[PDB]
């Protein structure tokens with residue numbers, strides 16, 4: 545509970561100010577925990593920051609959730625639809641959170657904790673997506689066309705999660721963020737794009 | 750000697766850009782900008798009025814570096830199919846990726862999206878909106894839908910986001926997430942064009958039957 549409270553408040557502060565502009569003292573005030581209770585649970589600020597980035601990644605989408613939807617019966621098209629659904633619903637239920645802010649800050653100015661998150665969270669999660677796209681296209685999960693398709697499929701969800709508000713009110717005025725309409729668009733678009741790049745890969749080979 | 754005044758304005762703009770990208774608006778002082786640019790406070794205020802006016806110019810320059818509005822307008826009015834024009838637009842973004850892996854433009858714009866200053870709305874209305882409007886007009890032509898049809902609006906995200914994600918995250922993706930990823934420009938552009946036209950045809954089919 546003290547561990548989770550420290551994690552939550554440090555997440556909010558790192559999202560607002562970034563690691564460089566965040567003090568051990570600010571974290572203790574917002575958290576209302578002592579320096580020694582921080583040092584006990586997280587060793588130091590760098591260890592707490594690592595825990596924050598790992599939590600932030602889990603809040604975007606839990607690896608256990610992806611494994612579950614990957615292992616249940618269904619066509620890879622149905623599983624893709626459930627994976628997309630997860631990201632789109634995050635847009636509807638957490639438009640406000642700190643997780644994507646702290647991850648985006650990390651991509652712009654990588655700390656030494658960045659590799660850990662990329663290896664333990666980003667890799668296996670992308671891997672599950674690559675295995676679904678590979679089945680849909682009949683290509684290996686690490687085929688260059690599958691690697692590029694992962695960007696094609698995941699990036700639109702990530703852009704919406706980060707930029708929904710300036711998009712809806714200044715750039716794409718009239719954009720509905722109603723989840724079903726976005727899921728349907730993303731699924732129809734992805735299956736059409738994956739069919740087209742699969743065709744060229746299968747003629748090259 | 751106007752050219753020499755432009756040099757001083759641009760010198761301060763470049764160093765300010767680099768600093769705002771590294772630190773953000775809240776943690777960057779006028780004394781830092783003066784030291785990095787090696788120009789005095791009066792030279793800064795001369796060119797930009799004040800620090801907030803300099804921040805605005807940095808964000809507008811950042812967006813212009815990503816893709817110039819003029820470049821989109823020129824490719825938009827040339828003769829050729831909307832598919833050709835979309836390929837030229839995508840080529841501009843992938844060439845940005847290939848020639849500017851380590852710039853400041855996208856870092857300062859991203860920080861703005863995360864924690865908007867009062868200058869952000871200006872970039873959105875004067876840079877984002879018209880550049881997205883030219884994209885929407887090409888996707889609409891491709892799908893035979895109005896440029897403000899909801900499918901056109903969503904398809905703008907579907908086409909532009911993969912470019913943005915690559916401009917911001919190319920290095921972690923190639924090194925740790927999508928190892929083996931080839932960011933060779935011709936193959937990226939070919940992939941983006943094949944994928945988009947397949948996806949655009951699929952959502953156009955559902956919009957025209959609905």
Ligand SMILES: C[C@@H](O)c1c(O)cc(O)c([C@@H](C)O)c1O
Pocket residue numbers: 604605665666669670671673694695698922926927
């Ligand atoms: C959530 C998961 O689908 C994911 C992720 O968490 C990070 C990432 O980089 C990728 C891309 C590259 O496919 C992903 O799919």
Ligand SMILES: C[C@@H](O)c1c(O)cc(O)c([C@@H](C)O)c1O
Pocket residue numbers: 711715716816876877878880881882884905906909
């Ligand atoms: C450059 C242009 O194509 C662009 C841009 O500069 C910002 C933006 O948000 C969008 C999206 C929404 O279409 C864009 O297309």
